Amino acid sequence: LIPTVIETRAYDIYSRLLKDRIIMLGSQIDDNVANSIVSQLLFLQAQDSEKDIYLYINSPGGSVTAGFAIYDTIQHIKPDVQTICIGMAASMGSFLLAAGAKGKRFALPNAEVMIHQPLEIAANHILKTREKLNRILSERTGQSIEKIQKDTDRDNFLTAEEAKEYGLIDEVMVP
Amino acid sequence: IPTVIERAYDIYSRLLKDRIIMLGSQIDDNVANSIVSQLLFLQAQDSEKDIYLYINSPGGSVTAGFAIYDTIQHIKPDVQTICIGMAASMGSFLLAAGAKGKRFALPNAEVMIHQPLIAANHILKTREKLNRILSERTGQSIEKIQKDTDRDNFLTAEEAKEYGLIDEVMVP
Amino acid sequence: IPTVIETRAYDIYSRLLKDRIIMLGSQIDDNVANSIVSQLLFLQAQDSEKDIYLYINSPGGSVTAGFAIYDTIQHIKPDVQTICIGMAASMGSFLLAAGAKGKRFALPNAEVMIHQPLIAANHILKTREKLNRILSERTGQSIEKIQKDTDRDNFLTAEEAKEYGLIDEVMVP
Amino acid sequence: IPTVIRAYDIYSRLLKDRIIMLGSQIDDNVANSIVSQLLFLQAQDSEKDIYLYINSPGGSVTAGFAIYDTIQHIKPDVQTICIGMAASMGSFLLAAGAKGKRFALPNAEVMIHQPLGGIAANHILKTREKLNRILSERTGQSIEKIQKDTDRDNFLTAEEAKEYGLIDEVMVP
Amino acid sequence: IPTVIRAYDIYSRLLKDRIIMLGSQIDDNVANSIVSQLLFLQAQDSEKDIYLYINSPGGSVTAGFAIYDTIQHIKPDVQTICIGMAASMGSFLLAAGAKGKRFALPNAEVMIHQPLIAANHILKTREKLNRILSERTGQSIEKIQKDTDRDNFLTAEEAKEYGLIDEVMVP
Amino acid sequence: IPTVIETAYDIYSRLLKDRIIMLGSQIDDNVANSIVSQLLFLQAQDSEKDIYLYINSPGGSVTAGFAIYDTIQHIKPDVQTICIGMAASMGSFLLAAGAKGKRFALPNAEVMIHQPLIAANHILKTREKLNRILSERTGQSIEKIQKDTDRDNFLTAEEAKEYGLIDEVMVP
Amino acid sequence: IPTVIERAYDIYSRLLKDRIIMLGSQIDDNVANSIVSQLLFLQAQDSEKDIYLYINSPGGSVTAGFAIYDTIQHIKPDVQTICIGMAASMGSFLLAAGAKGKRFALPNAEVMIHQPLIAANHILKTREKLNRILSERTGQSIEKIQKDTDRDNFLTAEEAKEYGLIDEVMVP
Amino acid sequence: IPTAYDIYSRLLKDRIIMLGSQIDDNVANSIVSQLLFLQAQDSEKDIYLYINSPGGSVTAGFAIYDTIQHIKPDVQTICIGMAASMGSFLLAAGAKGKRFALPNAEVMIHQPLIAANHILKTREKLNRILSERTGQSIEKIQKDTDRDNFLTAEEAKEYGLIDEVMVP
Amino acid sequence: IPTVIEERAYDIYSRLLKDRIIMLGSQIDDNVANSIVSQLLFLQAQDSEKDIYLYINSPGGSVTAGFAIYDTIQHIKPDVQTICIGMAASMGSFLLAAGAKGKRFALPNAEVMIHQPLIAANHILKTREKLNRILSERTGQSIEKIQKDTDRDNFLTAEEAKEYGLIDEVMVP
Amino acid sequence: IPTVIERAYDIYSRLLKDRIIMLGSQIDDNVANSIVSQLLFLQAQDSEKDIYLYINSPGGSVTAGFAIYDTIQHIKPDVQTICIGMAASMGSFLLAAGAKGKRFALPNAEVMIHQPLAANHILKTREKLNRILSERTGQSIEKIQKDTDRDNFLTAEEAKEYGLIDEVMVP
Amino acid sequence: IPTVIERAYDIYSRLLKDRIIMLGSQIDDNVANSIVSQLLFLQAQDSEKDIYLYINSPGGSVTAGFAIYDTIQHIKPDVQTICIGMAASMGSFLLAAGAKGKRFALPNAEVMIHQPLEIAANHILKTREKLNRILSERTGQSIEKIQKDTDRDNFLTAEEAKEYGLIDEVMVP
């Protein structure tokens, strides 16, 4: 499922999108996805430190650690990382959605968003990093930590407009 | 997938050079990410020129279908839709979602609007949303579409036109 | 599948495509259908006036997939010649008969079978009568004859296929 | 499948009460098993009723027919009771029980759709007409009404099934 | 699965005491086994109670209805006892037991969420599920319709309040 | 297969007590050696009482077919054949091979005399051997049986009676 | 498991006759259902005689564990728990859950009360359920338990006596 | 395989052993045991070995061969279906006067082809043993076991591999 | 397959095809036949006058697939030289004998076998009669002898095969 | 299996440019079709220049070994054979079939002349190999027959003495 | 394995541009075939310049190892052996086998001389005898001591391997 594009040079579609500073996160997040995403972010920062990056998100979520690698890289680099949810952003996918530059987090009208953080590691360290997630989510949305602690414990499916109301995105994109 | 040189592509890649996107499988997230990317690619090359999305699809994921739906609506280009073979469920929803006056089917092509049945209530909620968009795009009442997407009828290309799922049946 | 390089690289199918030649050498499913349809649409954009050549060695396949190639053959402006090498069975034989009039061919030892093997039953029968109606138009046979023969497994000689109206000529060596 | 004490499993222990469970897709292994049970029960007694419980999605025509012919051949009455579902060939076997003794539980769904693809087409169609004719005889419906209905997918309530003539009574708690 | 001795496995020895264990997902195989145990027990004695223990994630609606109907048809009262979990079709069968005689142990969990071949028939049998749950629990059909569409775990005590069981079996 | 305990057999063993053999599958060496054994067992219990061979078989190995066939002919007891469901290829050869006047089919049974296609010469040799045995046991000419065993037409129970493969169709 | 004729018991069937139940693996629903049925069985035979539950288990399903728990609490007879080898998570919960005065470990037995981490809020609700019960059964405050069950501590048989998880370490 | 015995176990009661498969070491060890069991019961009465076999391992075939020859009882051999390779060799190895075939049974003496010298050496011993048990010259068995030739039951009697074709 | 550059990169087979060499090195099925036919069609479009060299090391395969290859050898204009290296069996030996007059060769240690080994039985027998007739035409042997011989497995030496009319020459080192 | 750029090759294609064919696996039909093709290609580029066939092979198919043998003997250029590691059966036969004076082994290479086993055809082709080995080694046919029926590992020097190779290459 | 555009490479091919070869896995025939090829290539490229063979290997096939060994000794240029990570069994024999003065190891590398025990026992013990013999020459240890130490699985430090005579130097940062 990846066509070729030859300018007058052969790119598959994603590599051609990367040329325009577009990164497609279209899968479950594991370490392989994270290493690839971080790499693309580093490449694009190196090309241009002033120019916006566009990160598109269609993701069921995944590994907290891998999710955090991408997060911290988004925060480190100078360029503004816009975020755009195109199909779904659940758990760590919605966390990355909300971690886009302020004013620059978007979703298409019909995109679903879920803040539910589900669940060998010791229980106390899982709970410790969870607190870390809630604290970061509390800031980037303007909601109280109490309210985010509750909400991430349930599997609430948000509409694009609920997400905006909630503070996970800045705008719903209009045709 | 044969190779073509004008610098070498496969067929689909050469068709994309003429702004042709082929949707020829069940729609899952990988297909969705792929169709969306191509549409985004095409938009940036020319925001004015038409896009042609051929559809031969038994359907698939609602969320994947909607991601493609929304990209069609969002981009500036008119997306034509042409049904060859079959458009079922979410494939039939995408066919109906093409630019007005520019939804087509070949003569022997087939269309089934039945949308098959994670919290039930969420599924049923997104389901009401599909019926309304299908009402808006066909001109049929919401109640009529309610009944029809819950039953598995096959429409001929001609029935699909009479129904408002397409604008024209293409003739040789 | 060997490579062909013109001082530009192709595989044989791709270089045969350069001569407006398409090879259908397998069971027809959705993947083969989309591949063939694309080749036809491509070849049409290259030149709307020149003949296209469709070689058929196929045991059959999906009615849906077969109808997508059918309608695409009809839709495009160029003549599609059909050439049966090896075998045309079921939906394979339908596409052989779908070629431009006067331009449906078969090699001398090729074999044709129009038996169409047997979603609600109602719809299967409906699209069957639609196959039968179309084969009747393309072969010159009455729909009652097509009806009986598509319900039985029936190997036609290349010459018999000519006598039937499935092909126009048997290619002489 | 638990043990009952001479140690049976439940089915073996129910066979002692002349009860046969048809709880699966019907194929040749199921058919041979059902047939042998029916022949064994005729051997034990030719006068006493048999009880065939049916919870089955359907299956092979030929296998359905081997059971059907064996129900008709043996001397005893074979009661049929639909628990859960009787589809395709399972609904045909439901309607083939002794007249007056075809039952369904209140919530059991019956569907007379006979699938085509789920042999030469002609032969399949021949045996379809024979199934239709038998269904006509056993429901009291016209061969024509039954043609239409078995070509389509309808789930019938137990009551509608009785209204139809597929069963004689709905068992009340 | 231990053996007890005249040689039985435990389930079969429990069967001798008119106890049936529903301990898994309900499919047609599970359904046929259960229905068979009921018909067997009924023949053996039409007056004596039957005990159905339930630890089930759920399953096939057809399979579940097969069991439901057989429970209702036979003469003996069938007591239902939820141990562990009753979800979806398992919770339906729990409610399906003789009224006065539906139980759960204190840490048991009940979920009535009914998860979602043509759409109209599925929605049709949903309404038929809802209407029976409405009768057996005393809750209005509008309330059951809402609650079976949402995924929600109930305490044994909460399930008693709801009308799915008659009592929490206190230790 | 259920259990039957008398005052423990599986069903098939209980039927074997009545001299009933069930051939319900594709004929391979393993099926052949089971069938031959049941035959030698029953000849030994009683060399005078009929044996009942029920046939629901898609066919199988020619060699395994012949091992069963040669055993039927060699033992003293009359072997009745009853086709339930289907008899094809070597299943129909064995059906025709039961005692004269004791070959039966249920009304909806299907019978296919098609023998489908070692060095080629030896396959053809043992086919001539099949054809000549079918010739004797049906009363049809060797010419005719050659044409007919070379085609795959399905025969009605009654059509198989007319053919001479069975003696009677069993009435309810 | 080998046979023992006392009528042929496997060793587990033999031990069940002495009211001995062995829980020797990860706790899933099959195991839970097996243990529950064995409990109900032994309870039927004699509601006054002790039952002995030997535990060597890495833990398992909380629901499956609670089903075993609830049945121990429900039945009349005293369930003695004996840890041979290991009791972890739900294994150690079931160990602590035996009759008061009658919870044992072999001297080299290991005990770990870490409960590992399907909506998050429901999981956390059931953990609290465990913590409170462990609190009732050890004499420790819910706060020490909620702290200790969140981390990877291995307890010696002796240390587990210190903790109130077992009553006695079995003298050889 | 119906039933307390299963059929084969019931036939063993009547001193009947059924070789219905490829001959490998599992099969060989089974046959040998049955042969030893039967002679323990009565070393006088005949044993009946039915053969329907595509052949198999030389070594495994020689284990059955040697057990037949060793024991006191006559071991009749009866080919049903086919005896090929080691199966045909075992057929010809039955008590003299007591090697039978059913009328449509098929016999093939081709023995198809660890160092090559060992297998060519063991092959000579087979040829020599077939020459003895048929009354053919060794040079004729040499040629004949080197090609793949199906014999009729009658042809096999004419060859000396069986004594009689069984009459129905 | 290793690579050769003339920067035009081939695999050896693509490099050979440059020099009009096709290697039929495997069991003949649909995939193989489709490949060879296309290579034959390619080479024909390239130069219709110059010879083609078809090297054959093959145990045989599908009859349909064989005839598809045969029919294309006969149809195209170029002379197709056939060279047996190693083995030609069944349809391999049939394709070997189908090469140009005076231009069918074998390497000295090559083995050739005409046995064709054994869809309704009668269709098989009728296409067998096709092969035998053609073998008769190309070897000069009577149809009697060929029928007799295609029904048994005899291995033919390079020289024996020349004797028989399957090849024209044995290639001298 | 690295890439070399002059034009981009893998090492084998790069070595093919220097007329070096590497026979490094069991011989089957695919290996034979490949080696033959390389030999044909190489004779097309130059018919007088030597070719170098390195052999590390446990053996393989007889038909396939003969296809390669026959191609070697047919083409004009001299085919030097070099045994690295092992040459067994059909491997050792292809070692022996190299141009006279131009058949080599490395000092620690191993050579096994054992040929493993309708039977009559197998024996015939086996008499065919024996007769070619005898010609090329210079050994009597009776001695080849004894030795190929035996599993006999030959030292590089022992293989020289035997006449399978001409020289043992020196470090 | 990343690309390198200098012309495109994977890293190993780029390193091979600098006469560096990486032996990174268990040695079998496919590894040996590769290493030998890389060595003949580098010789042909330049017969006087040093080759650098990096060894990180648990060892493997004796025949395969000796093929690598013989090629190192045959070709003209010096082969340096550098153990990174692990050299065990035939890996450590290959390490000993590098140009005298030019066998190296990283400081934390591990070296195991144990040569573990389908061929006859007699041949295995005889090719083992030449392994011992060759290690005695290259290390300077008596054959008696070599026999002893290669029958035991002791692990050497890079330094102990130096004192043993398997390498010349432990590499300095």
Element spanning B29, H or E: helix B29-45
Q: Which residue type, as a one-letter code, is found at position A92?
A: M
Coil, strand or helix at F137: helix
The half-sphere exposure of G7 on its side-chain side, counting CA atoms within 13 A, is 6
Neighbours of chain E (3+ CB pairs under 8 A): B, D, G
The encoded tokens of residue K109 equal 């590398």
| Per-residue buried b or exposed e for K46-58, using 16+ beta carbons within 10 Å of the residue's own CB | eeeeebbbbbbbb
Tokens at B167, concatenated = 């604008």
C-alpha to C-alpha distance for C13 and C1, rounded to whole angstroms: 8
Of H116, H117, H147, the CB nearest to J120: H147
CB J9 within 8 A of CB I3: yes
Closest alpha carbon to C107 in C154, C37, C172, C54: C172
The CATH number assigned to the domain holding B98 equals 3.90.226.10
Query: Would you call F114 helix, strand, or coil by DSSP?
Result: coil
DSSP string, chain C: --EEE---EEEHHHHHHHTTEEEE-S-B-HHHHHHHHHHHHHHHHH-SSS-EEEEEEE--B-HHHHHHHHHHHHHSSS-EEEEEEEEEETHHHHHHTTSPTT-EEE-TT-EEE-------HHHHHHHHHHHHHHHHHHH---HHHHHHHHTS--EEEHHHHHHHTS-SEEPP-
Residue in the block written with tokens 């091919």: K13
Residues just before a chain gap in chain K (C–N exceeding 2.5 Å) are 6, 117
Three-state secondary-structure class, residue D18: coil
CA atoms of G167 and B97, how far apart (whole Å): 71
Residue with tokens 């959705």, as numbered in its chain: C30
Phi/psi for K85 (5° steps) reads 75, -95
Task: State the total domains in chain D.
Answer: 1
Direct distance between the N- and C-terminal alpha carbons of chain H, in angstroms, rounded to an integer: 26
Burial class of residue F86, CB neighbours in 10 A (0-12, 13-18, 19+): buried
Contact D58, D90 (CB under 8 A): yes
**Interatomic CA distance for residues K24 and K27, integer angstroms:** 9
D-C interface (Cβ pairs under 8 Å ≥ 3): yes
- The angle at the Cα of J142, spanning J140 to J146, to the nearest 5 degrees, equals 120
Q: Which residues contact K159 (CB under 8 A, 6 or more apart)?
A: K170
Residue A24 sits at the chain B interface (C-beta within 8 Å): yes
* Inter-chain residue contact I75 with C107, CB threshold 8 Å: yes
In this structure, are residues E83 and G70 in contact, taking their beta carbons and an 8 Å threshold? Answer: yes
Q: Which residues pair with J8 in a beta bridge?
A: J5
CA dist., res. A52 & res. A73, Å (int) = 14
> Taking CA atoms, what residue in F is nearest to D3?
F3
Token digits of residue C157: 């000689």
Q: For residues A133, A139, A143 and A144, what is the CA-based torsion angle, rounded to 10 degrees?
A: 70
- Enumerate residues 6+ apart whose C-beta is below 8 A from E127: none
How many Å apart are CA C155 and CA I67, to the nearest integer?
15
Tokens of A11: 């790119």
SS3 sequence, I95-158? HHCCCCCCCEEECCCCEEECCCCCCCHHHHHHHHHHHHHHHHHHHCCCHHHHHHHHCCCCCECH
CB pair distance less than 8 Å for A3 and B30: no
Catalytic one among H30, H85, H131, H137? H85
Give C91 to chain I, closest Cα distance, Å: 17
Residue with tokens 């060794």: H138
Nearest-angstrom CA–CA distance, H83 and H105: 8
Q: Per DSSP, which regions of G63-159 are E strands? A: 79-88, 103-105, 110-112, 155-156
Angle at C31 between CA C27 and CA C32, to 5 degrees: 45
What ranges in A20-109 are assigned the alpha helix state H?
31-47, 64-76, 92-97
Residues of D in contact with C116 (CB under 8 A): 121
The rounded Cα E35 to chain-centroid distance in angstroms is 12
Chain C residue numbers with beta carbons less than 8 Å from the beta carbon of D116 are: 118, 121, 124-125
**Lookup: tokens for E34:** 């259960």
Burial (CB < 10 A; 0-12, 13-18, 19+), residue E162, is buried
User: Which of C121, C124, C151 has the CB atom closest to D122's CB atom?
Assistant: C151
Dist CA B94 CA B87 (whole Å): 9
Closest C-alpha to G137, from G72, G59, G54: G72
d(CA J170, CA E6): 83
Distance from CA of I111 to the nearest CA of C (A): 27
Q: Is F71 on the interface with I (CB under 8 A)?
A: no
Helical residues (DSSP H) of chain J, grouped into ranges: 11-17, 29-45, 62-74, 90-96, 119-137, 141-148, 156-162
> Which residue from H minimizes the CA distance to F15?
H2
User: Residue I170's CB: how many other CB atoms inside 10 A?
Assistant: 17
Distance CA I81, CA I98 (A): 9
* Non-local CB neighbours of K7 within 8 Å, separated by 6+ positions: J5, J8
Q: CB D130 to CB F108 under 8 A?
A: yes
Report the alpha-carbon distance of residue H65 to residue H88 in Å, rounded. Answer: 11
> Which chain J residue shows the shortest CA-CA distance from I172?
J74
Return the active site residues of I.
90, 115
Structure tokens at G11: 């060793």
Separation of alpha carbons H2 and F21, rounded Å = 10
- Of K16, K93, K6, K8, the C-alpha closest to K57 is K93
Rounded Cα distance between E50 and E38, Å, is 8
Q: Which residues of K are catalytic?
A: 89, 114
Give the C-alpha distances (Å, rounded to integers) separating A140 from A69, A100, G38: 17, 9, 55
Which tokens is J142 given?
């009776």
Q: Which two tokens stand for residue H102?
A: 């059913």
- Resolution of this model in Å is 2.4
Q: Which of B41, B45, B47, B75 to mutate to test the interface with A (most CBs of A within 10 A)?
A: B41
What is each CA distance from K72 to E44, K66, K94, in whole angstroms?
Answer: 87, 10, 9
Distance from CA of F105 to the nearest CA of I (A): 25
CA torsion sign for B136, B141, B147, B153 is negative
Question: How many CB contacts within 8 angstroms connect chain E with chain G?
Answer: 83
Say if CB D156 and CB D95 are below 8 A apart.
no
**Strands (DSSP E) found in chain D:** 3-4, 8-9, 19-22, 50-56, 78-87, 102-104, 109-111, 169-170
Q: Measure the N-to-C terminal CA separation of chain E; round to a whole number of Å.
A: 26
Nearest to I166 by CA among I71, I108, I88, I60: I88
H110 catalytically annotated? yes
**8 Å CB contact of I14 and C4:** yes
Q: Reduce the DSSP state of residue B170 to 3 states and report it.
A: coil
DSSP summary character for residue K76:
S
Touch F-B: 3+ C-beta pairs under 8 A: no
Q: What is the C-alpha to C-alpha distance for residues J155 and K130, in angstroms, rounded to an integer? A: 11
Secondary-structure percent of chain G, ordered helix, strand, coil, rounded to 5: 45, 25, 35
Q: List, in sequence order, every residue forming a beta bridge with B116; answer none if it has no partner.
A: none
Give DSSP secondary structure letters for chain E: --EE---EEHHHHHHHTTEEEE-S-B-HHHHHHHHHHHHHHHHH-SSS-EEEEEEE--B-HHHHHHHHHHHHHSSS-EEEEEEEEEETHHHHHHHTSPTT-EEE-TT-EEE-------HHHHHHHHHHHHHHHHHHH---HHHHHHHTTS--EE-HHHHHHHTS-SEE---
**How wide is the angle at C-alpha K14 spanned by C-alphas K12 and K18, nearest 5°?**
105
User: Inter-chain contact E7–G10, Cβ cutoff 8 Å?
Assistant: no
CB G63 within 8 Å of CB E24: no
Query: What's the CA gap between I134 and I155, in Å, rounded?
Result: 20
Helix ranges restricted to H, D16-120: 28-44, 61-73, 89-94
CB A58 within 8 A of CB A86: yes
Q: Is G101 left (phi over 0), alpha (psi -120 to 50) or beta?
A: left
- What 3-state DSSP class applies to A56? strand
Q: How far apart are the first and last CA of chain D?
A: 26
Nearest-angstrom CA–CA distance, A141 and A169: 8
Vertex J27 angle, CA J25 and J31, to 5°: 85
Chain D neighbours among C 48-67 (CB < 8 Å)?
Answer: none
| Distance, CA of C34 to CA of B2 (rounded, Å) | 12
Chain-chain contact of K44 with J18 (C-beta, under 8 angstroms): yes
Instruction: Give the domain range for residue H120.
Output: 1-168
Element (H, E) at F80: strand F79-88
- The span from the CA of B111 to the CA of B155, in Å, is 5
Cite the DSSP H helix spans in G5-80. 11-17, 29-45, 62-74
Report chain E residues whose CB lies below 8 A from the CB of D17: 43
User: How far apart are alpha carbons C68 and C45 in whole angstroms?
Assistant: 18
B37 is a catalytic site residue: no
Interface present between C and A (3 or more CB pairs within 8 Å): no
How far, in Å, CA of K39 to CA of K16, rounded? 10
Residues, chain A: 175
Distance CA(E55)–CA(E168), nearest Å, equals: 15
Looking at chain A from residue 155 to 174, which residues have their Cβ under 8 Å from any Cβ of chain B? 155, 157, 173
Q: Which residues contact J130 (CB under 8 A, 6 or more apart)?
A: J141, J144, J145, J148
The answer to whether the beta carbons of residues C138 and C146 sit under 8 Å apart is no
Retrieve residue G54's tokens. Answer: 């030997």
The span from the CA of C10 to the CA of G166, in Å, is 76
Q: Do the Cβ atoms of B120 and E118 come within 8 Å?
A: no
Query: What whole-number distance in Å separates Cα of residue C3 and Cα of residue J18?
Result: 23
Q: Can you give the three-state secondary structure of H104-161, one letter per residue? A: CCEEECCCCCCCHHHHHHHHHHHHHHHHHHHCCCHHHHHHHHCCCCEEEHHHHHHHCC
Tell me if chain A has a CB within 8 Å of the CB of B37: yes
Dmax over Cα atoms in chain B, in whole Å?
A: 53
**Rounded Cα distance, K173 and K170, in Å:** 10
Structure tokens at K2: 């990343």
Asked if K71 contacts J24 with a C-beta cutoff of 8 angstroms, the reply is no
Residue H139: partners with Cβ closer than 8 Å, 6 or more residues away: none
Choose among D5, D21, D107: nearest Cβ to E6: D5
What span, in angstroms and rounded, lies between the C-alpha atoms of J38 and I19? 13
Give me the phi and psi of C48, to 5 degrees please: -75, -5
Residues of H in contact with J118 (CB under 8 A): 110, 112, 146-148
Residue whose pair of structure tokens reads 């009929």 in the numeric block: F50
Residue of H nearest to F133 (CA): H104
Give, for I58, the enclosing helix (H) or strand (E). strand I52-58
Q: Provide the sign of the torsion angle of the four alpha carbons F95, F96, F99, F100, taken in this order.
A: positive
CA distance E3 to G41: 11
Of F13, F11, F48, F50, give the one whose Cα is nearest residue F34. Answer: F13
Q: What is the largest CA-CA distance in chain D?
A: 52
Distance CA C158, CA C88 (A): 10
Method: X-ray
Residue H14: DSSP 8-state: T
Largest Cα–Cα distance in chain G?
Answer: 52
Is A37 within 8 Å of A70 (Cβ atoms)?
A: yes
Paired tokens of E42: 């009924």
B137/B99 Cα distance (integer angstroms)? 10
Q: What count of other Cβ atoms lies within 10 Å of the Cβ of residue H167?
A: 8
Which residues neighbour K69 within 8 Å (Cβ) at sequence distance 6 or greater? J108, K93, K94, K97, K134
Q: Environment class of residue I10 by beta-carbon count within 10 Å: exposed (0-12), middle (13-18) or buried (19+)? A: buried
